[PDB]
Short mmCIF file of C-alpha atoms in Angstrom, two decimals:
data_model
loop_
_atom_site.label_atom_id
_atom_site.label_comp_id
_atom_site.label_asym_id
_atom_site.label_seq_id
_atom_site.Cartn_x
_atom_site.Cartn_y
_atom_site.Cartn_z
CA UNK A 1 70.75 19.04 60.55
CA UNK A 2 74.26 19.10 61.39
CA UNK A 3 76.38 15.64 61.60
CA UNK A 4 79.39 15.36 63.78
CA UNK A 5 82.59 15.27 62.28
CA UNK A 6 87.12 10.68 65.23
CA UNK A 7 85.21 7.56 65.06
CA UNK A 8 82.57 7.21 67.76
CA UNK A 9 81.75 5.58 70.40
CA UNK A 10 78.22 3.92 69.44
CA UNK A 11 78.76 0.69 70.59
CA UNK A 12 81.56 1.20 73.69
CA UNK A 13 81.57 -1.90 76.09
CA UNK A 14 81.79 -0.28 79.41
CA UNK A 15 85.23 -0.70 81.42
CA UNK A 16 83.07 -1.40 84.88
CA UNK A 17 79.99 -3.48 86.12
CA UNK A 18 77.01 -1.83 85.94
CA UNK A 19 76.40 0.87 88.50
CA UNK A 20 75.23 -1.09 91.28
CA UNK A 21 77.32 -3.65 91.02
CA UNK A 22 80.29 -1.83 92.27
CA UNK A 23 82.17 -1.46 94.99
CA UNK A 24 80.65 1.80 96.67
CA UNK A 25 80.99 3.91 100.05
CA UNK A 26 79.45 7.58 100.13
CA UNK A 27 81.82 10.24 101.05
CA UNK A 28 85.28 8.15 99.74
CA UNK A 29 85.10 8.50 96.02
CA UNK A 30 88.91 8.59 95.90
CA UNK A 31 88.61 4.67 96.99
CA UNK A 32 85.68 4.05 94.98
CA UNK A 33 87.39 5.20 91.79
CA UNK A 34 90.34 3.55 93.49
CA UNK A 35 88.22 -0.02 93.12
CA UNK A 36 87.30 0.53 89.48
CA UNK A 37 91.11 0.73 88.30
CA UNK A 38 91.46 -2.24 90.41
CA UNK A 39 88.73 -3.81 88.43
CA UNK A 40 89.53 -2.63 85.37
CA UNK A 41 93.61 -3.61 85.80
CA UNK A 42 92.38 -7.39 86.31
CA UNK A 43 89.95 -7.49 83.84
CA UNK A 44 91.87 -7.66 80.75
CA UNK A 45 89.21 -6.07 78.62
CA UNK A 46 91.27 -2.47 78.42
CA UNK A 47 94.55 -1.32 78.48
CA UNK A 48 94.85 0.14 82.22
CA UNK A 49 97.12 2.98 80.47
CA UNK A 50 93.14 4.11 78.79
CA UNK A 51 92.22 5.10 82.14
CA UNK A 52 93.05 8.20 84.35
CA UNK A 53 92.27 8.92 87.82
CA UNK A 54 90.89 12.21 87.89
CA UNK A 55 90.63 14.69 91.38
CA UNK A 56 88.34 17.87 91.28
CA UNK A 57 88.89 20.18 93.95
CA UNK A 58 90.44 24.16 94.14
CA UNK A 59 92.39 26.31 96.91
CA UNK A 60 89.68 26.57 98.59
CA UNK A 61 88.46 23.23 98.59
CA UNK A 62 84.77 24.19 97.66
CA UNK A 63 83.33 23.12 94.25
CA UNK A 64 79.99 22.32 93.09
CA UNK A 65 79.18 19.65 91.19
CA UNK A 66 75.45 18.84 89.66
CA UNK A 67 73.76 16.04 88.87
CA UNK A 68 74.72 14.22 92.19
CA UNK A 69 72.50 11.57 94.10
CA UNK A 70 73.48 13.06 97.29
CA UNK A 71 71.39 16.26 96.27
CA UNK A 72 68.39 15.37 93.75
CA UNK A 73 67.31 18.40 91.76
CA UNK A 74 68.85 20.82 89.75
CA UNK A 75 70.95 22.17 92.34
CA UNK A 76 75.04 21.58 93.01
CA UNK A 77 76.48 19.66 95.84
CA UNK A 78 79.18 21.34 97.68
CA UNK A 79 82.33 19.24 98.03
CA UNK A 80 86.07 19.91 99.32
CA UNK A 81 87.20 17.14 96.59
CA UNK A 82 85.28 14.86 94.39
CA UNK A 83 87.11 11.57 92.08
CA UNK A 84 85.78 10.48 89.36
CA UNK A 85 87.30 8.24 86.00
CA UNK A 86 87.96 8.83 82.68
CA UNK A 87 88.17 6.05 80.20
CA UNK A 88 89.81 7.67 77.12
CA UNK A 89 88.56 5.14 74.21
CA UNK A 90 90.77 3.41 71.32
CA UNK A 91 89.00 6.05 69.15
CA UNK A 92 89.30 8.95 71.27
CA UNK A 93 85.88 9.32 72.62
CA UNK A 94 86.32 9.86 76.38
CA UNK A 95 83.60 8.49 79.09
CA UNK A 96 83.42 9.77 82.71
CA UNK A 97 82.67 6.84 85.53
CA UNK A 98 81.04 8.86 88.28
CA UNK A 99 79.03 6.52 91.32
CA UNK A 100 77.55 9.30 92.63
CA UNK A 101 75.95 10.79 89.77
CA UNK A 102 72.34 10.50 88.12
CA UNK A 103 73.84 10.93 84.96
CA UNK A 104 74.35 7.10 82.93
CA UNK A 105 77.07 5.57 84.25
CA UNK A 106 79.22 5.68 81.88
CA UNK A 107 78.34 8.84 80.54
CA UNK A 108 79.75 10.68 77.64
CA UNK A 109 82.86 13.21 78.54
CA UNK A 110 81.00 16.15 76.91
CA UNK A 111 77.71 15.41 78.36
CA UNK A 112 79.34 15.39 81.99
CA UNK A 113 81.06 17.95 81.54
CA UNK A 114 78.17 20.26 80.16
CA UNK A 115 75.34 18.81 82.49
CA UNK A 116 77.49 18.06 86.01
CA UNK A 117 80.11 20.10 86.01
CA UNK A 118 79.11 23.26 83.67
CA UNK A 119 80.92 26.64 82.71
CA UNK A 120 82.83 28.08 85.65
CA UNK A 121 82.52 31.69 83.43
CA UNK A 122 79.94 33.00 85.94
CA UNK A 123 80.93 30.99 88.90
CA UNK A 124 82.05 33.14 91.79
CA UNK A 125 85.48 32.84 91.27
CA UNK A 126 86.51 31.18 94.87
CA UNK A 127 83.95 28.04 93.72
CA UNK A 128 85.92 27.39 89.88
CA UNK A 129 87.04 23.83 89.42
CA UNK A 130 90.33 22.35 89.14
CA UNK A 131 91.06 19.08 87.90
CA UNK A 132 94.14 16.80 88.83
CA UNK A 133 94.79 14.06 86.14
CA UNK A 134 96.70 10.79 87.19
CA UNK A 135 97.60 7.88 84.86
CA UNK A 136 95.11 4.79 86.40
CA UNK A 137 98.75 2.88 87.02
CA UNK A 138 100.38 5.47 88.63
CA UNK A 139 97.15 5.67 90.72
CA UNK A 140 97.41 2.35 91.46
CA UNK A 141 101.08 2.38 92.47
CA UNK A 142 100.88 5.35 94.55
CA UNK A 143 97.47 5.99 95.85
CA UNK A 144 97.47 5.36 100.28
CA UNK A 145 94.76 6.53 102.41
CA UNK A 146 94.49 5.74 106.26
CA UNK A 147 91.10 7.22 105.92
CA UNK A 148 92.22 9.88 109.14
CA UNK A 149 90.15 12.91 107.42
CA UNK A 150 87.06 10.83 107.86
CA UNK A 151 87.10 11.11 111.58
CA UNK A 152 85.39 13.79 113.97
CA UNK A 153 86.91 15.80 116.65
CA UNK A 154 87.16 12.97 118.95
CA UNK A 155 87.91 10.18 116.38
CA UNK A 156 84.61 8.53 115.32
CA UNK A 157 83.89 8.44 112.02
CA UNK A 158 81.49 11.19 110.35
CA UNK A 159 80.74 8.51 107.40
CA UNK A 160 81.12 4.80 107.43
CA UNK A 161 84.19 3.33 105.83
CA UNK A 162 84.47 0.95 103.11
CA UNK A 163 84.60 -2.64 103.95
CA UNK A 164 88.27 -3.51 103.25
CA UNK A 165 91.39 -2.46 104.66
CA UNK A 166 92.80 1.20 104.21
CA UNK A 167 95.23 1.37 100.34
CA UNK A 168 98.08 1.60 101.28
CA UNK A 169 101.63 1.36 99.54
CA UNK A 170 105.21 0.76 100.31
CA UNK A 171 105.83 4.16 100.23
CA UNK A 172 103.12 5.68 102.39
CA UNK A 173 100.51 5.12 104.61
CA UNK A 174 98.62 8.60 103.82
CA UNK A 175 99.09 11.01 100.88
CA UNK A 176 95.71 12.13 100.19
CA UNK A 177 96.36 15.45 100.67
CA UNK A 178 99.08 15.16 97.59
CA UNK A 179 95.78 14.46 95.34
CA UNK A 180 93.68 16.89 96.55
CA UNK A 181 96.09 19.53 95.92
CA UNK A 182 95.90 21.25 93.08
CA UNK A 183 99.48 22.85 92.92
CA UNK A 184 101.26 21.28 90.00
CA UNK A 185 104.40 21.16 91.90
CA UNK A 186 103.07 18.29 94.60
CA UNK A 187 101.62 14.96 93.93
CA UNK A 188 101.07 12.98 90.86
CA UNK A 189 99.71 13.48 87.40
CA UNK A 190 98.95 16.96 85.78
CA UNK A 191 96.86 19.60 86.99
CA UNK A 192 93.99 21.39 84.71
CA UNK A 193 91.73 24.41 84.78
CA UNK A 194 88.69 23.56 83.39
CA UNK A 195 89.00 25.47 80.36
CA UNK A 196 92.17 23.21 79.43
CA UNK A 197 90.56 20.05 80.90
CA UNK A 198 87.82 20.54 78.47
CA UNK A 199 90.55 21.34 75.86
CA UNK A 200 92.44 18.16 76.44
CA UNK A 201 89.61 15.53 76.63
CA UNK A 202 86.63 16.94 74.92
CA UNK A 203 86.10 16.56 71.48
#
């Protein structure tokens, strides 16, 4: 036997509707995620300053990610970003909100990160993960997407968009590309490796 040794988490409330209640479209995470901190901001149940935006992607923009619905099986889905959110609890257990995983929704930050994201030590090095971190205010605040990435070569979508009008802010109609980055000196937020994402959030 071997008990853990930070108060947890048994009973956390989660921060979103179930699953299936939310707000989902397949292919825009960064609005999905987008929608929870909406939710979560006029909720009142947690402090909005708990919750962090959080953009995987690399130089490349190739990562895999397991554990997704779009792929069942034990196999990774290829993305050129994917957004998911962290709740960081009063206690400092941290939960990940992912839509378009099979994992629970919430699920545990070390279970994510062991089951859907795993080591990148023996990943071909162009594939390793990056993580961008954004406060869920300043994600809020800043966050615009005319959804213009989403179109084809002759300007029809490739996937359906979400059923509301594009974010956008005072400041910008578009800056998706300032998320997706993962050079520390653009955008928003703070930019990991997964070695000192782990670090940071894991317990």
């Amino acid at each position: 036997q071997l008990m853990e040794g930070g108060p947890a988490a048994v009973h956390y409330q989660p921060a979103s509707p179930p699953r299936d209640a939310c707000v989902y479209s397949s292919c825009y995470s960064e609005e999905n995620v987008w929608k929870l901190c909406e939710y979560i901001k006029n909720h009142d149940q947690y402090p909005l300053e708990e919750c962090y935006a959080v953009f995987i992607s690399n130089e490349r923009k190739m990562i895999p990610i397991w554990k997704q619905q779009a792929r069942p099986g034990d196999g990774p889905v290829i993305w050129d970003y994917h957004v998911v959110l962290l709740h960081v609890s009063s206690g400092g257990q941290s939960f990940i909100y992912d839509l378009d995983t099979v994992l629970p929704f919430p699920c545990l930050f070390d279970t994510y990160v062991e089951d859907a994201i795993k080591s990148d030590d023996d990943i071909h090095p162009q594939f390793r993960r990056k993580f961008r971190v954004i406060c869920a205010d300043s994600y809020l605040k800043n966050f615009a997407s005319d959804r213009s990435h989403m179109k084809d070569s002759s300007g029809n979508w490739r996937e359906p968009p979400p059923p509301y009008p594009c974010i956008e802010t005072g400041d910008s109609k578009m800056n998706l590309n300032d998320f997706i980055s993962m050079d520390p000196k653009v955008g928003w937020g703070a930019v990991y490796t997964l070695s000192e994402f782990t670090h940071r959030f894991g317990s």
